[PDB]
Design a protein around this ligand. Structure first.
Ligand code: CLA
Ligand code: CLA
Ligand code: CLA
Ligand code: CLA
Ligand code: CLA
Ligand code: CLA
Ligand code: CLA
Ligand code: CLA
Ligand SMILES: CCCCCCCCCCCCCCCC(=O)OC[C@H](COP(=O)(O)OC[C@@H](O)CO)OC(=O)CCCCCCCCCCCCCCC
Ligand SMILES: CC1=C(/C=C/C(C)=C/C=C/C(C)=C/C=C/C=C(C)/C=C/C=C(C)/C=C/C2=C(C)CCCC2(C)C)C(C)(C)CCC1
Ligand code: SF4
Lengths: 73, 45, 218, 742, 39, 206
C-alpha cells in the first residue's frame, strides 16, 4: 500500500497532472484502473507477436513474479 | 389397404413373431416386435 | 367363480368377496400389502363404485339430448352434442339462465355439502346423524357400509331386503358401472377422433359398417 | 413381485422439533457449550447417514428432500416466467430480436441504483438478461405476456404440488425400502415414462404449436396478428396451409407412408439462414425419434412378467481372465448404498452438462441465440462450471461410500478389490502422466515466452515457426464436413457450421457461425485441458483409493471421511482425509474450468464472432489474434485479460456498473479466502482468548464460548470464498465484456 | 404454537426479521431524506 | 361439551370446551391452543366484532337511505378523501388521544381485570362488569341487560359474536366490492337481485 501510494502520487506529479491521483485515488476502481491497468501498457508490450524491445526483461520478470507467487500459493 | 406390400409385410411379421416359439404380455411383446420389424422392413424397401 | 385375466398375486387377495370379483388386477393395485393414502382395497372398491355410478349417469346424459333431438321430442336448440353444451367453450357454447362459471360455483356449492358429508360417513360412519341438519340427519345415518348407505333418502323403495337379492343387485350395479365407464371413455376418444356426436357415429356405423370405421377415420 | 409398498404415518407432524435445534443428532440436540455447535448444526444437517443406521428412513428423507428441491425449482421457473411477463421487454424483442437486448429485471429507484436500469431497447429500461429465456419462449411459440403469466401460475401450482408431495411421502405415506430398491422398475419407468413420454409429448407441442407459430414469425407477420396456438389444433386448415401433410391426417403414419411427413419432419442439418438456429423441423423429428428410442429402451428390465433382463444377471455374466469374478456383487452394492449411486450419477450428470455446453455452442438450438453472444458465452461458462462441480461431488461421494459403506466381508466385489490391490500403480502412473503433460503443455508456453522475449520468434511453437498441427482434429473436421455427401446421404448440410468445410451463417449483420480453424494454439490449449483434467483426476482418485488406508496411515478408515489429519507425527499428516482431497480437487477444477472458459471466450471473440459486411467481409471482435497471441502467457496477460478487462473497469457511471462493483467485490472475497487458507486456528484461538478477556472485563462475555473455526471448516470457508471470488470475478469480466462489445 | 413461537425466536429468524425491519427503515428514511451527506 | 360444530363429524380441539360464547370448535390452525393466546384472541374478536358491526351499519344503513330520497351522503369508500371543517389529520390526532385513552384503560383491564373499574376524578362512579370484555356500569350498560343468568349471558354474547362475524365479513365484502365493481354496495345488491345469473363476480373478471 505505501509503495503503491508513493509511486502513483509521484508518477502523477512527474506527468504534470496531480488531478489524476487526486480524483482517482478516492475509490478503489481508480487505483485498479488508473494506476495498475494504465501503467502496465508499455510493460506488457516488452515482447509481443510483432517484436520486442528493451522492456522484454521487465515483462518476463513480471510474469516470473506472478508464477513464483502462485507456486507459493 | 388390404393386399398392399406394407400390409402383407406387417401382418406376416406380427404372425411370425407371435408364432415364436402363452400370456397377454407375450402377445403384446411379440406384437410390438413384429410391428417394429415390419416397419423396419417396409421402410427399408 | 369364473376368472378374467387373473394371477397368483391377484387370486391371493381377491377371493370373490366383492361384487364383480373376476380376479382381475394384473398390476396389483388392491394388494393389501403396504397400503396407505389412496392405494387401499376398501377405498379402491368405494372409488370404483362412485366412478361407476357417476359414469352410469353420464353415459346416458351425454347421449340423451343428441338422441331426443334426432327424434324430435326436444327442440333443436337443446339438441346439442355433449361437448357442445358449454363444457368445452371453444367446441360450443349455450346461453343458459346463468353464466357457465357462475353455474360452476353453484355446482361446487351443492356438491360441496353432498360430497363432504358422504366422506364424513367414510371417515366416521356414526356421524351425519348426530349434528342437526333440518331434521335430515335421521335419514343420513348410513348403514355401516360407506358405499351402500340406504335409508329413507337413498333407498325409499326398500330394495335388497334379502341377502341373495342384495348381492345380486350389487353385482349388476358393478357390471353396469364398468360398462358405463367404458362408455364414457368411448365418448371421449370417439368424439376426439370423429368430431361428431357418439350417436351420429352409431348412425354412421349402422348405415355403412365397412366404410364408417375406426380404421377409416383418422 | 414389484408392487407399491408404503408405511402409513411414520412420523407425526409437529413444530416440536422446530423448537429444538439439532434434533436429528443426539450430540447436537443437547445444546451449545461453545460456538462450534452452531457450525456443526449446519454441517451435519443433510448427512442422513450420521442420523440413522436404518437405510429405509434415510431413503424416505432423501425422497422428500428431492420433492423439496423440485418445489424450489418450480418456484424458480415460476419467477422467471412471471418476471418475463410483468417486468420485461419480451414482446418488443419479438418485434425486433436483432436490435433489442433481452431484459427481464428492473430495479427500484433508491440510493441511485436506478442507473442500473439501462437502455435495452423496446422503449424499456432495465437489466439485460443473459439466461436465454427469450429465445426459448420464442421457440416454444409464446407471443404474449398472458401466456407467460399462465405458465407462471402453472409453475407455482406445481411448486405447491411438489411441496405437498414431500410432506405426504414423508409424514403420511412413506415408501418401503423394497420400493426404493426396485431398480429394474425404476429404470423402466424413467426410460420410458420420463424421457420417452417427455420428448414424445414435447414433440407434440413442437409439431402442433412451435412449427406453425415460428413459421409465421419467420414470415414476418406481427406476433399479435399471428393465430393463437389452439387454432392450429382446432383448424387443421392452417397447418395444412403451412405443411400440406396434415391434409392427409394421421393416415400416412399408420399406413407407413412416412415419406409424406417430410414437410415438417426433416433431416437437413446445419442452421436456418434466417434465424441462426437449428431447423425446428429437424428438432421435432429429433424428439420424435428420441421418444421412440427411449420408449423401447424402457422395456428392457424384468418386472412383474417373465420378459425382461435382470440387472444382477447381466452383471454376473461379465467376468474375464484379468478380472476374475468381474461385476458380481455390484448389484447389491448399488442397491444398498446411496453414496455409490450419487457418485455415479454426479459424474455422469456433470459430464452431461459439459457436453451440453459444447453442443449448445456449436449447434445453436434456439432462434436468435447464436447472435446473442452474451447469452452464448454465459450459457457455455455456466454449464461448464455446474459440470465441474458435479464431477468433484462425484469424487466426494465415491470416497464417502469408500469409508462408510464399503464392507468386503458382507458385500464383496472383485473389480473393486483388484483396483485396491494395485492402487499404487494407478496413482503413480497418473502422477507421471500428469508431470509429462504439464511439461509438454505449459513448458511449450514458457518456451514460447522465452524465445519471444529473446528476439527469437522463429524458435517458437507456432503456425509461423515450429508447427504443431492438430492433424487428427482437422481430419475429424474434414470427415464431418464431407459426411452429408458420403456416410450420411439423407442429410442436406453438416450437423454444425464449425466443421472444417462449409459456408457461413449470419443473422442481422452478425456472424452466427462459421468453420472453426484449428492450429498450433489449439493443440496447445487442448493439451493444457488434458493436463488440468488429468491432475484433477489424480487428486480426486488418489483421495478415494487411499480413503481407507495407506502405508502412512494403516487405519485411516476409522478416522472417518472428514477429519483434519492424524497429527504432526510421521513427519506430518495434514490433509490425509478424502475430504481434503475433495478440497484440493476443487481448486484444480476451478483452474481447469477457468482456462476452459477463457479458451472459449478468446476463440469465439477472435475467430468466430464479429460483424459481417456486404460482399462477405467478416470483421471479428478481436481480429483473429488468437493464433498468434495465445501461444505465450504474456499474450493472455495482455491481449486477453488486460485488453478485455477494459469494459469492466470503465463500466462505472453506466448500466453495467454493477459488474464493476462485482469485479472488485469478487477480487476482495477471493483475497479474503487466503486468510483462511494460509493460516491455522491456534493463532485465532489465542487472539480470541485476549478478546474474551476484554469482554469479561466489561461483563459482556457470552455463555456460548467463542471458539475459532475447526481446521476443516477453515479449509471449507477458504475454498468456498476462493471459488466464489474467482468465479464471480470471471463472471463480471465476461458479462461486462460481452455485453459492451457485443 | 408455543413451539412455533420458540422457532420464530431462534437466532436466524430473529436476525432476518430484525435486519429486515432495519433495512425497511433505512430505505424509507433514505427515500424521504435522500442524498444526505450532512447530519 | 355437547354442541353443534363448524365441521360435522369432527372432534373439536381440547382447548375449546364450549363454555365460551361462539364456540363451534373452529380453530384448524390452533391459534388459540395456548390459554393466554385464546383469551387475548377472544378480546380481539370482541372489539373486531363491535367495530365491524358499527362499521357495517355505518356503510350499509346510510348507503341504503342514500339510494332513496331520505339522505344524500356520499359513498362510504370516498367519504374519507374529502375535506371537513378542519384537516383530517387534526381529527386523526384527537381520535388518537381520545380512543387512545379508552383503549388504554381497556388494555389495563385486559392485563389486570380489576384496576380500571373506578373513575379517577369521581370515586363515586364505578363499573359493574364481572368478566373482561364486558365493562357494564352506567356508561356501557344503562339498561342493566349486561347482568343476568349465565344462560342469558351465553345466548346474548353468542348473538353478539355471531352478528360480529357477519359484520366483519360484510365490511370486508364492501371494501372488495367497491374495489372491483366501482359502485356502492346497494347498487351491487340491486344488480344481483335484478339478474343473479350473470350479474355476479364473473361479470367483470370473465
Ligand atoms: C428387410 C431388409 C432391410 C433393408 C434393405 C433395409 C435398408 C435400410 N435401412 Mg432398415 N431395418 C430393417 C430392415 C431393412 N432395412 C430391420 C429388420 C430393422 C429393425 C426393425 C431396420 C431398422 C432400421 C433403422 C433404425 C434405420 C434403418 C435404415 C435403413 C437404410 C440405411 C441402412 C444403412 O445405414 O446402411 C436402408 C434403406 C436407416 C435409415 O436411414 O432409414 C431410412 C435407419 O436409421 N433400418
Ligand atoms: C348426472 C349427470 C348429468 C349432468 C351433469 C347433466 C347436465 C346437463 N344436462 Mg343432462 N341428462 C342426464 C344426466 C346429466 N345431465 C341424464 C341421466 C338424462 C336422461 C334423463 C339427461 C337428459 C337431458 C336432456 C333432455 C337435457 C339435458 C340437459 C343438460 C344440460 C342442462 C341442464 C339444466 O339446464 O339444468 C346440462 C349440461 C339439457 C341440455 O342442454 O342438453 C344439451 C337438455 O335439454 N339432460
Ligand atoms: C408444513 C408443515 C410441517 C411440519 C410442522 C413438519 C415437521 C417436521 N418435519 Mg417435515 N416435511 C414437510 C412439512 C412439515 N414438516 C414438507 C413440506 C416436506 C417436504 C420437504 C417435509 C419433509 C421432511 C423430511 C425429509 C424430514 C422432515 C422432518 C420433520 C421433523 C423435524 C424437522 C425440523 O424440525 O426442522 C425444520 C426445518 C426447517 C425450519 C428448515 C426448512 C428448510 C427448507 C424447507 C429448505 C429450503 C430453504 C431454501 C434453501 C431457502 C434458502 C434461502 C437462502 C437463505 C439461501 C418435524 C416434525 C425430519 C424428521 O422427521 O426427522 C426425524 C426429516 O428428516 N420433514
Ligand atoms: C447431487 C447433489 C448432492 C447431494 C444431495 C449431496 C449431499 C451431501 N453432500 Mg455432497 N457434494 C456435491 C453434491 C451433492 N452432495 C457436489 C457438487 C460437491 C462438490 C462441491 C460435493 C462435495 C461434498 C463434500 C466435501 C461433503 C459433501 C457432503 C454431503 C452430505 C452432507 C451435506 C450437508 O449436510 O451440508 C449442509 C449444506 C451446506 C452447509 C450448504 C452450504 C454450502 C456453501 C456454504 C454454499 C455455497 C455458497 C453459494 C454458492 C452462494 C452463497 C451466496 C450468499 C449466501 C453469500 C450430503 C449427503 C459432506 C459429507 O460429510 O458427506 C457424508 C461433505 O463433507 N459433499
Ligand atoms: C502456479 C503455480 C503452481 C505450479 C507451477 C504448480 C505445479 C505443480 N503442481 Mg500445483 N498447486 C498450486 C499451484 C502450482 N502448482 C496451488 C495454488 C495449489 C493449491 C490448490 C496446488 C496443489 C496441487 C495438488 C493437489 C497437485 C499439484 C501438482 C503439481 C505438479 C503437477 C505435475 C506437473 O505438471 O509438473 C510439471 C511442472 C510444471 C508444469 C511447472 C513448470 C515447469 C518449468 C517450466 C520447468 C523449468 C525448467 C527447469 C526445471 C528450470 C530449472 C532452472 C534452475 C536449475 C535454475 C506441478 C509441479 C500435482 C502433482 O504433484 O502431480 C504429479 C498434484 O496432485 N499442485
Ligand atoms: C419495515 C419498515 C418500514 C417502515 C418504517 C415503512 C414506513 C413507511 N412506508 Mg413502507 N414499505 C416497506 C417497509 C417500511 N415502510 C416495505 C417492506 C414495502 C414493500 C411492500 C413498503 C412499501 C411502501 C409503499 C408502496 C408506500 C410505503 C409508505 C410508507 C410510509 C407511510 C406513511 C411510511 C414512512 C407510503 C409512502 O409514504 O410512500 C411515499 C407508500 O406509498 N411503503
Ligand atoms: C462504513 C462507513 C460508511 C459511512 C460513514 C456511510 C455514510 C453514508 N452513506 Mg454509505 N455505504 C457504505 C459505508 C458507509 N456509508 C458501504 C460499505 C456501502 C456499500 C453497500 C455504502 C453504500 C451507500 C449508498 C448507495 C448510499 C450511501 C449513503 C450514505 C449516507 C446516508 C445518510 C443517511 O443514511 O441518512 C441519515 C440516516 C439516519 C439519520 C439513520 C438514523 C435513524 C435513527 C432511527 C435515528 C434515531 C434517533 C433517535 C451517509 C453519509 C447514501 C448517500 O446519500 O450518500 C451520500 C446513499 O445513497 N451509502
Ligand atoms: C348486534 C349484536 C350485539 C348483541 C347481541 C350485543 C349484546 C350485548 N352487549 Mg354489545 N355491542 C355491540 C353489539 C351487540 N351487543 C356493538 C356493535 C357495540 C359497539 C357499540 C357493543 C358494545 C358493548 C358495550 C360497551 C357493552 C355491551 C354489552 C352487551 C351485553 C348487554 C347489553 C345488551 O343486552 O344489548 C343487547 C343488544 C341489542 C338489543 C341490539 C341493539 C340494537 C340497536 C342498535 C340498539 C340501539 C340503542 C342505542 C341506545 C342507540 C349484551 C351481551 C354490555 C355488557 O356486556 O355488560 C356486562 C356492555 O357494557 N356491548
Ligand atoms: C484399454 C485396455 C483394456 O480395456 O483392457 C481390458 C483388460 C481385460 O478385461 P477383462 O476381459 O478381464 O474384463 C472382463 C470383465 O471384467 C468386464 O466385462 O482389463 C485389464 O486387465 C486392465 C488393463 C489396464 C491397462 C492399463 C490402463
Ligand atoms: C389363436 C386364437 C385366437 C387369435 C388370436 C390372435 C390372432 C391374436 C392376435 C393378436 C395380435 C395380432 C396382437 C397384436 C398386437 C400388436 C401391437 C401391440 C403393436 C404395437 C405396435 C407398436 C407399439 C408400435 C410402435 C412404433 C411406433 C408407434 C412408431 C415407431 C416405430 C414403432 C414400431 C416402434 C382367438 C382369440 C381368435 C381365439 C383363441 C385362439
Ligand atoms: S493439521 Fe494442523 S494440526 Fe493437524 S497436523 Fe497439520 S498442522 Fe498439525
Amino acid at each position: 500500500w505505501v509503495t503503491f501510494y508513493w509511486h502513483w502520487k509521484h508518477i502523477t506529479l512527474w506527468r504534470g497532472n496531480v488531478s489524476q491521483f487526486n480524483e482517482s485515488s478516492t475509490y478503489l476502481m481508480g487505483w485498479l484502473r488508473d494506476y495498475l491497468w494504465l501503467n502496465s501498457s508499455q510493460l506488457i508490450n516488452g515482447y509481443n507477436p510483432f517484436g520486442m524491445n528493451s522492456l522484454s526483461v521487465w515483462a518476463w520478470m513480471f510474469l516470473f513474479g506472478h508464477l513464483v507467487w502462485a507456486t507459493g500459493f | 389397404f388390404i393386399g398392399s406390400p406394407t400390409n402383407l409385410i406387417m401382418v406376416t411379421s406380427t404372425s411370425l413373431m407371435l408364432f415364436a416359439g402363452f400370456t397377454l404380455a407375450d402377445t403384446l411383446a411379440c406384437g410390438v416386435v413384429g410391428h417394429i420389424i415390419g416397419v423396419g422392413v417396409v421402410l427399408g424397401l | 367363480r369364473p376368472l378374467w385375466f387373473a394371477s397368483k398375486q391377484s387370486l391371493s387377495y381377491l377371493d370373490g368377496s366383492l361384487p364383480g370379483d373376476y380376479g382381475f388386477d394384473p398390476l396389483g393395485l388392491s394388494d393389501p400389502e403396504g397400503t396407505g393414502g389412496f392405494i387401499e382395497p376398501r377405498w379402491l372398491a368405494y372409488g370404483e363404485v362412485i366412478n361407476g355410478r357417476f359414469a352410469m349417469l353420464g353415459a346416458v346424459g351425454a347421449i340423451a339430448p343428441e338422441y331426443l333431438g334426432k327424434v324430435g321430442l326436444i327442440p333443436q336448440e337443446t339438441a346439442l352434442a355433449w361437448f357442445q353444451t358449454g363444457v368445452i367453450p371453444p367446441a360450443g357454447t349455450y346461453n343458459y339462465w346463468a353464466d357457465n362459471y357462475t353455474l360452476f360455483v353453484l355446482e361446487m356449492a351443492l356438491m360441496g355439502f353432498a360430497e363432504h358429508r358422504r366422506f364424513q360417513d367414510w371417515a366416521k360412519p356414526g356421524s351425519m346423524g348426530k349434528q342437526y341438519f333440518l331434521g335430515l340427519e335421521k335419514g343420513f345415518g348410513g348403514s355401516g357400509n360407506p358405499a351402500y348407505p340406504g335409508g329413507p333418502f337413498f333407498n325409499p323403495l326398500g330394495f335388497g331386503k334379502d341377502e341373495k337379492s342384495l348381492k345380486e343387485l350389487k353385482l349388476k350395479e358393478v357390471k353396469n358401472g364398468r360398462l358405463a365407464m367404458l362408455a364414457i371413455l368411448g365418448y371421449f376418444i370417439q368424439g376426439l377422433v370423429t368430431g361428431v356426436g357418439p350417436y351420429q357415429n352409431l348412425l354412421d356405423h349402422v348405415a355403412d359398417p365397412v366404410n364408417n370405421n375406426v380404421l377409416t377415420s383418422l | 413381485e414389484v408392487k407399491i409398498l408404503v408405511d402409513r404415518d411414520p412420523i407425526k407432524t409437529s413444530f416440536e422439533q422446530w423448537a429444538k435445534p439439532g434434533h436429528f443428532s443426539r450430540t447436537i440436540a443437547k445444546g451449545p457449550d461453545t460456538t462450534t455447535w452452531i457450525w456443526n448444526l449446519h454441517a451435519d444437517a443433510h448427512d442422513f447417514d450420521s442420523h440413522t443406521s436404518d437405510l429405509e428412513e434415510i431413503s424416505r428423507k432423501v425422497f422428500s428432500a428431492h420433492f423439496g428441491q423440485l418445489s424450489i425449482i418450480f418456484l424458480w421457473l415460476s419467477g422467471m416466467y412471471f418476471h418475463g411477463a410483468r417486468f420485461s421487454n419480451y414482446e418488443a424483442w419479438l418485434n425486433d430480436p436483432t436490435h433489442i437486448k433481452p431484459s427481464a429485471q428492473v430495479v427500484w429507484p433508491i440510493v441511485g441504483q436506478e442507473i442500473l436500469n439501462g437502455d435495452v431497447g423496446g422503449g424499456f429500461r432495465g437489466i439485460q438478461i443473459t439466461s436465454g429465456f427469450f429465445q426459448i419462449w420464442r421457440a416454444s411459440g409464446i407471443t404474449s405476456e398472458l401466456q407467460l403469466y399462465c405458465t407462471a401460475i402453472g409453475a407455482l401450482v406445481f411448486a405447491g404440488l411438489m411441496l405437498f408431495a414431500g410432506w405426504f411421502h414423508y409424514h403420511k405415506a412413506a415408501p418401503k425400502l423394497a420400493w426404493f430398491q426396485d431398480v429394474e422398475s425404476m429404470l423402466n419407468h424413467h426410460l420410458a415414462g420420463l424421457l420417452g413420454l417427455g420428448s414424445l409429448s414435447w414433440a407434440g407441442h413442437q409439431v402442433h404449436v412451435s412449427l406453425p407459430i415460428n413459421q409465421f414469425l419467420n414470415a414476418g407477420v406481427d406476433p399479435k396478428e399471428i393465430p393463437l396456438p389452439h387454432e392450429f389444433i382446432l383448424n387443421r386448415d392452417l397447418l395444412a396451409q403451412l405443411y400440406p401433410s396434415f391434409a392427409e391426417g394421421a393416415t400416412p403414419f399408420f399406413t407407413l407412408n412416412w415419406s409424406k411427413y417430410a414437410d415438417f419432419l426433416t433431416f437437413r442439418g446445419g442452421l436456418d439462414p434466417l434465424t441462426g438456429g437449428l431447423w425446428l423441423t429437424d428438432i421435432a423429428h429429433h424428439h420424435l425419434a428420441i421418444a421412440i428410442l427411449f420408449l423401447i429402451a424402457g422395456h428392457m428390465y424384468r418386472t412383474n412378467w417373465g420378459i425382461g433382463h435382470g440387472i444382477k444377471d447381466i452383471l454376473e455374466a461379465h467376468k474375464g481372465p484379468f478380472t476374475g469374478q468381474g461385476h458380481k456383487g455390484l448389484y447389491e452394492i448399488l442397491t444398498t448404498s446411496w453414496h455409490a449411486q450419487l457418485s455415479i450419477n454426479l459424474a455422469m450428470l456433470g459430464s452431461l452438462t459439459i457436453v451440453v455446453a459444447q453442443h449448445m455452442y456449436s449447434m445453436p438450438p434456439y432462434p436468435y441465440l447464436a447472435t446473442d453472444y452474451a447469452t452464448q458465452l454465459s450459457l457455455f461458462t455456466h454449464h461448464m462450471w455446474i459440470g465441474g462441480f458435479l464431477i468433484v461431488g462425484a469424487a466426494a461421494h465415491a470416497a464417502i461410500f469408500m469409508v462408510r459403506d464399503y464392507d468386503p466381508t458382507t458385500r464383496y466385489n472383485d473389480l473393486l478389490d483388484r483396483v485396491l490391490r494395485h492402487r499404487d500403480a494407478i496413482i503413480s502412473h497418473l502422477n507421471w502422466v500428469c508431470i509429462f503433460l504439464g511439461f509438454h503443455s505449459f513448458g511449450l508456453y514458457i518456451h514460447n515466452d522465452t524465445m519471444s522475449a529473446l528476439g527469437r520468434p522463429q524458435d517458437m511453437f507456432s503456425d509461423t515457426a515450429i508447427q504443431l498441427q492438430p492433424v487428427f482434429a482437422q481430419w475429424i473436421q474434414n470427415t464431418h464436413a464431407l459426411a452429408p455427401g458420403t456416410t450420411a446421404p439423407g442429410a442436406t448440410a453438416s450437423t454444425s457450421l464449425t466443421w472444417g468445410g462449409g459456408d457461413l451463417v449470419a443473422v442481422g449483420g452478425k456472424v452466427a457461425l462459421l468453420p472453426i480453424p484449428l492450429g498450433t494454439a489449439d493443440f496447445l490449449v487442448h493439451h493444457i485441458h488434458a493436463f488440468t483434467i488429468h491432475v484433477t483426476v489424480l487428486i480426486l482418485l488418489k483421495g478415494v483409493l487411499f480413503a481407507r488406508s495407506s502405508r502412512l496411515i494403516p487405519d485411516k478408515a476409522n478416522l472417518g471421511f472428514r477429519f483434519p489429519c492424524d497429527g504432526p507425527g510421521r513427519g506430518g499428516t495434514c490433509q490425509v482425509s478424502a475430504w481434503d482431497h475433495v478440497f484440493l480437487g476443487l481448486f484444480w477444477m476451478y483452474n481447469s474450468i477457468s482456462v476452459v472458459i477463457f479458451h472459449f471466450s478468446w476463440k469465439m471473440q477472435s475467430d468466430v464472432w464479429g460483424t459481417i459486411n456486404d460482399q462477405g467481409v467478416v470483421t471479428h471482435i478481436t481480429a483473429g489474434n488468437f493464433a498468434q497471441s495465445s501461444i505465450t502467457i504474456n499474450g493472455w496477460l495482455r491481449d486477453f485479460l488486460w485488453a478485455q478487462a477494459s469494459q469492466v473497469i470503465q463500466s462505472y457511471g453506466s448500466s453495467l456498473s454493477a459488474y464493476g462493483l462485482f469485479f472488485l467485490g469478487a477480487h476482495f472475497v477471493w483475497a479474503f479466502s487466503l486468510m483462511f487458507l494460509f493460516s491455522g486456528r491456534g493463532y485465532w484461538q489465542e487472539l480470541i482468548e485476549s478478546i474474551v478477556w476484554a469482554h469479561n472485563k466489561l461483563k459482556v462475555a457470552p455463555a456460548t464460548q467463542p471458539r475459532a473455526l475447526s481446521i476443516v471448516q477453515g479449509r471449507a470457508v477458504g475454498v468456498t470464498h476462493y471459488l466464489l471470488g474467482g468465479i464471480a470475478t470471471t463472471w463480471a469480466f465476461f458479462l461486462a465484456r460481452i455485453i459492451a462489445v457485443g | 404454537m408455543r413451539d412455533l413461537k420458540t422457532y420464530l425466536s431462534v437466532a436466524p429468524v430473529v436476525s432476518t426479521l430484525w435486519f429486515g425491519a432495519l433495512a425497511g427503515l433505512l430505505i424509507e428514511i433514505n427515500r424521504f431524506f435522500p442524498d444526505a451527506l450532512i447530519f | 361439551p355437547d354442541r353443534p360444530l363448524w365441521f360435522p363429524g369432527s372432534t373439536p380441539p381440547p382447548w375449546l370446551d364450549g363454555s365460551l360464547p361462539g364456540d363451534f370448535g373452529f380453530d384448524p390452525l390452533g391459534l388459540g391452543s395456548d390459554p393466554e393466546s385464546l383469551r387475548w384472541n377472544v378480546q380481539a374478536e370482541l372489539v373486531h366484532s363491535r367495530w365491524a358491526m358499527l362499521g357495517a351499519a355505518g356503510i350499509f344503513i346510510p348507503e341504503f337511505l342514500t339510494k332513496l330520497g331520505i339522505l344524500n351522503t356520499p359513498s362510504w369508500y370516498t367519504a374519507g378523501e374529502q375535506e371537513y371543517f378542519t384537516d383530517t389529520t387534526t381529527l386523526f390526532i384527537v381520535e388518537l388521544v381520545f380512543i387512545g385513552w379508552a383503549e388504554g384503560r381497556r388494555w389495563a383491564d385486559i392485563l389486570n381485570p380489576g384496576c380500571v373499574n373506578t373513575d379517577p376524578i369521581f370515586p363515586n362512579n364505578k363499573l359493574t362488569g364481572t368478566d373482561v370484555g364486558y365493562p357494564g356500569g352506567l356508561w356501557f350498560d344503562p339498561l342493566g341487560w349486561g347482568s343476568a343468568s349465565p344462560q342469558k349471558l351465553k345466548e346474548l354474547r353468542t348473538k353478539e359474536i355471531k352478528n360480529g362475524r357477519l359484520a366483519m365479513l360484510a365490511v370486508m365484502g364492501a371494501w372488495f366490492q367497491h374495489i372491483y365493481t366501482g359502485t356502492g354496495p346497494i347498487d351491487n345488491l340491486f344488480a344481483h337481485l335484478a339478474d343473479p345469473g350473470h350479474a355476479t363476480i364473473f361479470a367483470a373478471f370473465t
